[PDB]
Amino acid sequence: QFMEETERSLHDAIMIVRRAIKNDSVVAGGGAIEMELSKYLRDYSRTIPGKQQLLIGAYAKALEIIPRQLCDN
């Protein structure tokens, strides 16, 4: 049961290791950026809206679902 996820771990690196090469420009993983991106738009949920702060908040809501999907799963 153990062996394969290693072999998968090997191919995972070479992908994103080369992808660390592929795109030089890199952001912190684990949904790190999407967190403030919620604020940044919920800033605009504050900032601009005639209405769409709903839209802007609904959008910004979609950001952190993944680390929420990650930590909670």
């Binding site: 949920s45 504050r46 809206p49 005639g50 209405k51 702060q53």
Partner: protein
């Protein structure tokens, strides 16, 4: 007015500010407390909402404007862009505080605030209607 000198300008500009002002107060926290402030502030805007709703107008259009009216949070006509300003009691469109704008006395809110929160924690306690 005269016996209660301390009053808060606006009834809906105080509302969408407290959304943000608490959202910020929420944003500072984390954990449950960031939520524990958030949906409290998400209990607010309905107050100007049912207003323009009952005015046959779009409160979301109106309340997001007050939400859009800010830099930091406060209610003044002074900077009506960079802060909140007043309210329209027939609409919910922010009115210049001193001119058409709302003012609310000090106790009007602190009392209106807590009781709903008092009522909120109340039902929250009750899971059992149990009978014979």
């Amino acid at each position: 007015v005269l016996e209660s000198k301390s009053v808060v300008p606006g009834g809906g500009a105080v509302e969408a500010a407290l959304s943000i002002y608490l959202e910020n107060y929420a944003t500072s926290m984390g954990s449950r407390e960031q939520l524990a402030i958030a949906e409290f502030a998400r209990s607010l805007l309905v107050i100007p909402n049912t207003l323009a709703v009952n005015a046959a107008q779009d409160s979301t259009d109106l309340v997001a404007k007050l939400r859009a009216f800010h830099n930091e949070a406060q209610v003044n006509p002074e900077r009506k862009n960079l802060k909140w300003i007043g309210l329209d009691l027939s609409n919910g469109k922010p009115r210049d505080n001193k001119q058409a704008g709302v003012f609310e006395p000090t106790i009007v809110k602190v009392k209106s605030l807590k009781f709903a929160t008092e009522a909120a924690i109340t039902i929250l306690r009750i899971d059992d209607l149990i009978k014979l």
